[PDB]
């Protein structure tokens with residue numbers, strides 16, 4: 001009631017709390033709000049001459065294991081490295097990335113895999129979001145892992161004062177959000193292709209359809225009064241807190257809320273602000289446990305549903321929903337769609353045989369909104385942090401699992417179903433090689449036959465198909481099972497030796513005896 005009035009009231013409620021903050025608890029909240037960024041100087045200085053030259057040339061955007069932010073920071077490093085080369089050199093040494101696509105050299109990936117460790121910012125809210133709160137996951141340096149733990153414990157203890165039974169229902173809190181923070185997929189096609197000031201009604205129904213609940217595993221920083229959207233801020237959350245939600249007052253009319261809260265999506269509409277269309281999200285704070293309960297129930301249902309269809313013992317734990325972030329209900333809902341597309345597009349006998357092979361190794365299909373290095377099915381078989389990978393999808397042979405990360409975007413994929421089919425291609429590759437040699441299991445694509453076929457047809461299909469034999473097989477396998485016939489034909493057409501090689505590996509799997 002009165003924007004300035006609302007502000008003043010909330011501030012006063014928290015006034016004593018703010019006055020009691022130590023210079024330590026006050027520096028902590030500042031660190032939480034403004035993460036400590038790596039110094040570009042320090043980084044470049046730590047490199048040797050050869051590494052500088054490598055970093056200088058390397059096709060940064062070619063890496064499939066780096067976030068945009070990490071790709072970008074690295075590109076500034078690249079500029080500074082050449083920030084002392086002729087204009088022509090600079091224009092030339094960058095005007096070839098146009099027709100540039102070269103899955104990096106092994107020696108390039110190794111270098112970047114290690115450099116990625118040195119370019120991380122100290123970001124408490126990101127750590128929590130990336131791990132879904134599972135802050136002991138061995139996805140970062142032990143020493144840094146412990147500092148995060150301490151800061152987080154320290155911040156949890158500061159945020160002890162509830163909003164109160166007087167204010168909760170008397171105030172809405174706000175949050176602007178970039179759609180790409182929940183769905184990088186819908187995000188790049190949910191703003192009307194033609195008129196950017198509008199929302200595509202088709203997608204919006206998509207988005208909305210399955211948006212029932214959301215979790216915050218980090219500390220939401222919310223505005224006491226709604227703020228005009230910035231650039232890519234097409235989501236405008238209107239949040240109602242529970243009488244017992246803990247928070248702290250932040251200068252400039254903001255609140256930091258306690259981590260691990262649950263939210264119930266009450267209404268989602270398309271609304272108009274300053275002549276542009278925005279998506280309004282009305283949410284209500286509820287206990288996380290009440291949402292974790294919906295998730296565990298959805299997990300049990302999907303497994304019982306599939307254990308029957310795939311004829312496995314009912315109690316079989318095949319599917320895991322490792323869900324902790326703000327687009328939670330979508331990840332759950334998405335898994336149903338994906339497994340349906342998978343079944344509607346691949347011979348039932350291929351599905352059963354391969355899925356049984358995974359099950360025999362205690363494999364899983366992991367649908368998640370936390371980064372892949374934090375999924376035990378990967379990390380328990382990858383001690384070296386530099387070899388751990390975050391990406392749209394992953395197949396881990398050692399654990400016979402498929403990991404599929406919801407929020408990210410895969411290379412030239414239309415949807416998550418397709419990422420899944422590609423991952424299943426990896427599993428098919430594994431099983432086939434196994435069938436040929438149970439006494440020395442190896443991947444079919446490691447066969448001399450396929451290797452020669454790769455050296456010949458390896459570049460005929462997707463750019464991503466060129467990365468290596470394994471991926472080429474997975475990409476052909478995916479395309480051979482697309483929902484669009486044209487794609488299925490181009491493989492048989494443009495890559496007949498591969499097509500026949502896969503169909504032959506499919507036939508072999510189907511024919512083998514139990």
Ligand SMILES: Cc1cc(S(=O)(=O)N[C@@H](C(=O)NO)C2CCOCC2)ccc1F
Nearest residue numbers: 064389391392393394395410411419422
């Ligand atoms: C075209 C395509 C790319 C990915 S990705 O963009 O997630 N790349 C990873 C992959 O192929 N996983 O199976 C790589 C990333 C580097 O480490 C190995 C897996 C996932 C599925 C898919 F269909």
Ligand SMILES: [Zn+2]
Nearest residue numbers: 422426471474
């Ligand atoms: Zn792959």
